[PDB]
Write an enzyme that holds these catalytic residues in place. Structure first.
Site, PDB file in Angstrom:
ATOM      1  CG  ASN B  89      -1.507  -8.316   3.856  1.00 21.04           C
ATOM      2  OD1 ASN B  89      -1.596  -9.361   3.219  1.00 21.04           O
ATOM      3  ND2 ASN B  89      -0.621  -8.144   4.822  1.00 21.04           N
ATOM      4  N   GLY B  95      -5.454  -8.637   6.829  1.00 21.75           N
ATOM      5  CA  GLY B  95      -4.474  -8.305   7.836  1.00 21.75           C
ATOM      6  C   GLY B  95      -3.763  -6.992   7.614  1.00 21.75           C
ATOM      7  CB  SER B  97      -1.185  -3.362  10.361  1.00 23.38           C
ATOM      8  OG  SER B  97       0.075  -3.355   9.724  1.00 23.38           O
ATOM      9  CG  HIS B 102       2.026  -2.043   2.763  1.00 25.08           C
ATOM     10  ND1 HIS B 102       0.856  -1.436   3.170  1.00 25.08           N
ATOM     11  CD2 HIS B 102       2.155  -3.157   3.524  1.00 25.08           C
ATOM     12  CE1 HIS B 102       0.292  -2.164   4.118  1.00 25.08           C
ATOM     13  NE2 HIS B 102       1.054  -3.219   4.343  1.00 25.08           N
ATOM     14  CG  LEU B 103       4.787  -5.821  -3.519  1.00 25.91           C
ATOM     15  CD1 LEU B 103       3.566  -6.661  -3.836  1.00 25.91           C
ATOM     16  CD2 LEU B 103       5.600  -5.513  -4.779  1.00 25.91           C
ATOM     17  CG  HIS B 104       4.156  -7.401   3.004  1.00 23.81           C
ATOM     18  ND1 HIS B 104       4.663  -7.203   4.271  1.00 23.81           N
ATOM     19  CD2 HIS B 104       2.868  -6.989   3.043  1.00 23.81           C
ATOM     20  CE1 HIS B 104       3.727  -6.662   5.031  1.00 23.81           C
ATOM     21  NE2 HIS B 104       2.628  -6.523   4.310  1.00 23.81           N
TER      22      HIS B 104
END
Ligand SMILES: Nc1ncnc2c1ncn2[C@@H]1O[C@H](CNS(=O)(=O)NC(=O)CCCC[C@@H]2SC[C@@H]3NC(=O)N[C@@H]32)[C@@H](O)[C@H]1O
EC number: 3.9.1.-
Lengths: 112, 116
Positions: B89, B95, B97, B102-104
């Protein structure tokens, strides 16, 4: 086996190309899910991220750097979402690794 | 200026706030998301502080690719044999935050389209 993204790389069918270099290609998605929705793909046929090799790390990062530069050039100054789908649960639609970049609207959570 | 910065992800890197860690090396850390959106939902973060993908430098390519390789290896080690979705993101419309890259990685259920 060959895929439609292979045909696009080989210039055998049309696509709206945003950027190309010696190792990747960025082009608008034919079924866009946001006002801007494009793909960045390697020219090397890696079928899915789960089979990418350690030696592919810089190439995969190159897709993301190309993606963020294209997003800036396309005016996505409020942000965007990058997505890689793997397998059936991931909803992977073509077995040639591809990075989606979507923006121009609020992206929501969960991401599918 | 502590290494990793002072976002919650920098604090996690330095073991100053707890996390459920899956994998750690000299370049990155993978740990479970506290607000999971799928039966398995983890994050892969660099130890180097980069606030967001839009400011990553050209020389960050190998690191960014390493996040994806670590993500796919962790997904396999966690038994996500039917697949998964990786998400980065950027900014407000993305989105984002926490302003540390970071990689989800999400799996363990059918993911839907569009991806948000
Ligand atoms: N202490 C924590 N431990 C683990 N994960 C966390 C923590 N705090 C926030 N997160 C996750 O960090 C992610 C931040 N990801 S976004 O920046 O992409 N923001 C969202 O989409 C929400 C979110 O998925 C958060 O659930």
């Amino acid at each position: 086996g060959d895929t439609i993204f292979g045909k696009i790389i080989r210039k055998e069918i049309p696509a709206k190309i945003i950027f190309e270099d010696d190792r990747c290609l960025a082009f608008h998605d034919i079924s866009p899910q946001a006002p801007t929705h494009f793909l960045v793909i390697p020219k090397k046929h890696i079928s899915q991220i789960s089979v990418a090799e350690d030696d592919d790390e810089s190439l995969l990062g190159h897709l993301m750097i190309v993606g963020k530069k294209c997003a800036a050039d396309l005016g996505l100054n409020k942000g965007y979402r990058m997505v890689v789908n793997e397998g059936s649960d991931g909803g992977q639609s073509v077995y040639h690794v591809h990075l989606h970049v979507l923006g121009g609207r609020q992206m929501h959570w969960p991401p599918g």
